[PDB]
Amino acid sequence: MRNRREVSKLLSERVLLLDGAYGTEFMKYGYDDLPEELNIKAPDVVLKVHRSYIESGSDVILTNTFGATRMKLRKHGLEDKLDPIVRNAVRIARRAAGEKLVFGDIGPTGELPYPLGSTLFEEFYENFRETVEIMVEEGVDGIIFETFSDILELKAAVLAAREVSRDVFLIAHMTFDEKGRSLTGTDPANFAITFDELDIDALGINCSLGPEEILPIFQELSQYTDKFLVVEPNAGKPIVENGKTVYPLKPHDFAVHIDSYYELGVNIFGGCCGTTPEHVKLFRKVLGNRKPLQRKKKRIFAVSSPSKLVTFDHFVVIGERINPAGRKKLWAEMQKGNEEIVIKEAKTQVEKGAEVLDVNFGIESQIDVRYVEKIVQTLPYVSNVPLSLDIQNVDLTERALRAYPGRSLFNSAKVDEEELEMKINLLKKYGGTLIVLLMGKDVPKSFEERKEYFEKALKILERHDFSDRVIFDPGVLPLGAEGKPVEVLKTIEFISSKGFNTTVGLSNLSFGLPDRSYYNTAFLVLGISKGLSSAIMNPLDETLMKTLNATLVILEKKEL
Amino acid sequence: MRNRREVSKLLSERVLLLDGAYGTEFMKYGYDDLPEELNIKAPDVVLKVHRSYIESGSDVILTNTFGATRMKLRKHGLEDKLDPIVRNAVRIARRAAGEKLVFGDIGPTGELPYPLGSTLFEEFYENFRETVEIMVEEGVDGIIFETFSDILELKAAVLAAREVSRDVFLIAHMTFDEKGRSLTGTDPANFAITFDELDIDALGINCSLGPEEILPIFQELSQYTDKFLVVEPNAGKPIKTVYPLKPHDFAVHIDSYYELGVNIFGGCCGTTPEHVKLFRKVLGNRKPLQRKKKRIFAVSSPSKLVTFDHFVVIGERINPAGRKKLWAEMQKGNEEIVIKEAKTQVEKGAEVLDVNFGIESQIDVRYVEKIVQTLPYVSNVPLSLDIQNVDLTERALRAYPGRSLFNSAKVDEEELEMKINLLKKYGGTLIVLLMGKDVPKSFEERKEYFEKALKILERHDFSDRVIFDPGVLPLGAEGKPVEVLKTIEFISSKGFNTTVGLSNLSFGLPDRSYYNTAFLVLGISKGLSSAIMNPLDETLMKTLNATLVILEKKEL
Ligand SMILES: N[C@@H](CCS)C(=O)O
């Protein structure tokens, strides 16, 4: 068993060759059984296939465990054979490989996450945890999650693997259709942006498409991560001939693509379904001995849901409405675990132009933690958009972040050493960006005071290597409570000038005032003129939204 | 006959004494006839009274003609005696004065301007012109309009006088009540700003109040004009014979008027030669004090002075373009509809009203002259006169009761000289639109027009009487409002007021209220000081108020 430090060192020195397909090989040997069952029924066939790749020059082989998790095995009446299936697979692969690397191979369950399917984050997490336990015990040199179609299920798999072992080399893959999207809508930039910041060692792509079709998809992935890169295309895109799936790409026509992947920074190259030992033999000759290429990676501030990447390069409307403050009905209904009411609020806001939704659960001791976990998992699927998680309690925050399907915005940390560090650390573990509110020991009462908090924040951020993952909220105070909005506008202009995104809790300005719509509208227009890049605001306020649109058109940021 | 250069020279050297009352003196000697009639019926009594004031120390005497104009004499069956009344008055005053100054004295007619009464501007103008001609013929050293209560009537008088003679020394007075207001609502700063820029030589106050009561009113007047200042307080309310304010107490106020820059001091109703004797003893020989006037940019109506030290809403609605019904009433000379539109806009927050007559050549000038005179009285607020025809421009400016804003000259040598000259003659301020031969598109293009304009305005000494309009183009027609916003910020940085025709931004687009609002907020954030806009748009107006509250230009 090699740990992640050893494997990373090896990769830094040499581009490695993976193996070909297993599922599409076994039939050629007269075995059409579920591949994982062969680990018990015919371990000799499994050994032969591994050896076929070792003898073709592979540096790494995958264990015969693609469908070996409880949730998937259950569908085939084999759940009670998890332990021997996985143990035998690892033992067989180790026998074939000798000193070569063995990666524990885990695919997805075929179960969609709730609300598309019935499955909650917690169930996927425990499912992947149990297979990874066996693999780590049996001494794998890494874990690879192949052919994932949904980011929540993949996030669960990575987090479960990392909780079993902080030392194992961990590789996360998605598979993409010909339009460059996963089943639940994630494009390669979103995949990269979301997963780069988790404690995985490598990202990659396998299956669905051939080497030609993957290239631009892989290029986009490579632009947004600095982690190691893996690719395993099919031997051409699958076609049906005389009632069977055929992968028509021959060894030379597949191998010619190696250079193009190498140029994009590939670290491990292999093949998925349709790839045979004949392909791998040629890959071995063509790849030879190469040091991988350095890349940087584009840096962007973006948040995501499964189907939407929201980049802060245009004004971002953050819908404020999922917040039970002053909403007696919503508050009562949240406490009873009503999902439909919150779902309706989400969809309406998006229909009216919210691109991200703030979600707050009021007096958090009064709310069921399981309802928070379900709401957070559900809204990005049903409403399509990313969330701003507006949570006070650090424990509940951890629950929400662990279960969030994408890269969230976390609403909010004040400028306090202890509070900032706690919230930063949670985001470092589970992914995400942070709103930093410019107040602390007290509430600022001028531009200069806000500027001092901003600089204190930057010092704490730099120390935690977190400066690129923040948006600043200068702290809008109520007009009727000596709010002094000119001071906020000065602060917006100042922070924008420094290259940071900004947001405000817009509706705070007009709290306790009649004609709040007009105060909110006037303030938003002024803020945008100073560089304000987003706002938590009411998208159902038609005057606010129409004036916003007019403002963006006028300032040449969009439209007609 | 001294000319105004001669009289000014004298005033620059010494504070002069006027005379006391005539009307109340003639009454007290038992003459209950109109004072002006005595020029025919008892010339020796007129001569006696003038002589008593000269002996008492007056440097200047007033001709006995206070009520001697055609419109006033007609109310007494005496209009056919205008000519002999005024000529005898001047001849008698000259006999009395010797080398001393004789000013032709003209008071108001007692007729209110339409619509408070029935008199139009032109009728007042003709009335004063006739009396000034006779006085100038007979050789006065000046003309003084005493005891005026209305700024339109006074404007007619001063323009009439100046049409007769550009050389005669001209003094314009208003009389103010205890609240510092003329009958039709003009306060001393309004009076000063409106009349200072007309071609008069002095401004002043007489009657209605005593020396003490006039002092703060006179101080206000003194702060807003650099011209010569005159005062003639009355001797209080009589309680008919016996007036309360006697020579010694009246005269002890002279020092306070001297310290405020007074140039001629006299007395009005109830004062006597014995008062003047004391003015002489108290004043002696003093050079007048120098002063620096406060400088502001302001427009006016009889009852309102609007200073551009806060955001000014200029109502756009009296404009028949795209409005078939309004236009049909304008063409049939309907006054009531325009009045209703004016009133509603002011009710909604308009502080100035833009007034445009559409296809001007299809509109009766009488109607225009009538609307222009009427609206400031009934609606209370100043007008932005939005007129293209240069002849109609002259008639509207001439008849306008106050200091107007004139809606628009482009940056063009010929057009500017034309408009500037009319405004120099009739009073007023100018919107200068930043286009010329070509409509500009960029910020630097607009800046070039601005500095072209500044060079033209500086050579005409008109720099201080302009608002700049950067020229807003419709968004659907390659507008680029960002260029306009940059121009506003620049012009503001140079200390100049700005305006825009707001509704042009959103011409042809849907949801125009939202584009108008967004641009207005953005403009204000850059220094925009006014806009021609729709005060009936609740969204616009409420968002405007919010903007000013947020930016600390006004309280919650
Ligand atoms: N490692 C798996 C991939 C299935 S998509 C196999 O080769 O069968």
Ligand SMILES: N[C@@H](CCS)C(=O)O
């Ligand atoms: N000069 C006139 C003024 C009357 S207000 C007079 O002395 O009678």
Ligand SMILES: [K+]
């Ligand atoms: K493989």
Ligand SMILES: [K+]
């Ligand atoms: K007098």
Ligand SMILES: [Y+3]
């Ligand atoms: Y620490």
Ligand SMILES: [Zn+2]
């Ligand atoms: Zn595959």
Ligand SMILES: [Zn+2]
């Ligand atoms: Zn008098």
